[PDB]
Amino acid sequence: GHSYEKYNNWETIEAWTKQVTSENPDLISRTAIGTTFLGNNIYLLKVGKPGPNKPAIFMDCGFHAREWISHAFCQWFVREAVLTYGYESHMTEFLNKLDFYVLPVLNIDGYIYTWTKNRMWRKTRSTNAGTTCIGTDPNRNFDAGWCTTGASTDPCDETYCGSAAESEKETKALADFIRNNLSSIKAYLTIHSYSQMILYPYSYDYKLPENNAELNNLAKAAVKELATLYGTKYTYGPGATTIYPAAGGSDDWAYDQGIKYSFTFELRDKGRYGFILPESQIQATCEETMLAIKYVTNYVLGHL
Ligand SMILES: CC(C)[C@H](NC(=O)CCc1ccccc1)P(=O)(O)O[C@H](C(=O)O)c1cccc(NC(=N)N)c1
Ligand SMILES: [Zn+2]
């Protein structure tokens, strides 16, 4: 069975996408935006009160297979949305005015592998020509200074950038969807772990985004909001100087598509458990993260 305070395998998450949609058709529509290398369905949930020409925020989880708290958060977010709509004034206004595109698990093949074989797998599970080595790092596979820094050209490496940008079916699927909906998507939020940070562009270069002052102020307020709940401390800043230079990430790519609010979230913790965050921290992690996401949403909406 599904549980929001446990990590769920893909079969269970998939069944959940169907069930939560069936139980809330007036707040959720489910589509598939492509298949993975191994033929799993890349679901996208459109969360919001349906209506014509609504702006949107796009959020994905599960880019990286071992970052299980990421997958957990997207599911947590969807429940909060459907349970509090109509009762909590902010979420009610959010869903009335915009849609959240929630992509609960991007790298499904890798996620399944962390359940079946290797908990610490990171990459996709696609084959590579001329080698037995498996997989591409999806967050090195976007057209953002592709493969120029912080990435490997070797398929046996954890940060393999791929044979070319969008060489992976999953990243191509995400990029295609975002490109087809640029008129509506106002923010891009991509959920990772761990490090307790909010990053904004750029990571592929030390250059700063034109609105970097605004992004810094926004990230600063979001981390302040997050801390109000349990005291959890986040830092923030441009990716390149705040964590490390790295090319081909989706946050940088989305920003260069014209999406002015683009953030990579790194959830708990700071390394004590690392990727293996206990299920006993799922609820607190998700609840505080919700405050940061809602703050950003409220800001983006108020500035349309
Ligand atoms: C613990 C966090 C920081 C994760 N990092 C890792 O697992 C380390 C990856 C690695 C493995 C082997 C050699 C070098 C680097 P991440 O979630 O994978 O970090 C993201 C990434 O490297 O794709 C990340 C963090 C912050 C900003 C970005 N954005 C970006 N465009 N690079 C991306
Ligand atoms: Zn990650």
Residue 33's domain spans which residues?
Answer: 1-304
| Burial category of 272 from C-beta neighbours within 10 Å (exposed 0-12, middle 13-18, buried 19 and up) | exposed
Atom of ligand 1 nearest to the CA of 239: 27
Amino acid identity of residue 55, one-letter, is P
* Nearest-10 Cα torsion for 239, 200, 177, 13: 80
Q: Is 169 in the pocket of ligand 1 (CB under 6 A)?
A: no
Which residue ranges are tagged as binding site? Answer: 64-67, 122, 139-140, 192-194, 244
Strand ranges across the sheet with 41-47: 28-35, 41-47, 99-103, 56-61, 185-193, 261-267, 197-200, 235-238
Mutation pick for ligand 1 pocket among 140, 193, 243, 269 (CB with most ligand atoms within 8 Å): 243
Atom of ligand 1 nearest to the CA of 122: 7
Contacts of 83 by beta carbon, 8 Å cutoff, 6+ apart: none
Mutation pick for ligand 1 pocket among 266, 268, 277 (CB with most ligand atoms within 8 Å): 266
Exactly one of 80, 266, 279, 287 is catalytic; which is it? 266
Measured in angstroms, the resolution is 1.6
The structural domain count of the chain equals: 1
Q: Answer for the pair 227, 295: CB distance below 8 angstroms, yes or no.
A: no
CATH number, domain of 266, equals 3.40.630.10
| Burial category of 14 from C-beta neighbours within 10 Å (exposed 0-12, middle 13-18, buried 19 and up) | middle
Query: What was the structure determination method?
Result: X-ray
Q: Is 269 in the pocket of ligand 1 (CB under 6 A)?
A: no
**Span from the CA of 153 to the centroid of ligand 1 (angstroms):** 16
Amino acid identity of residue 246, one-letter, is A
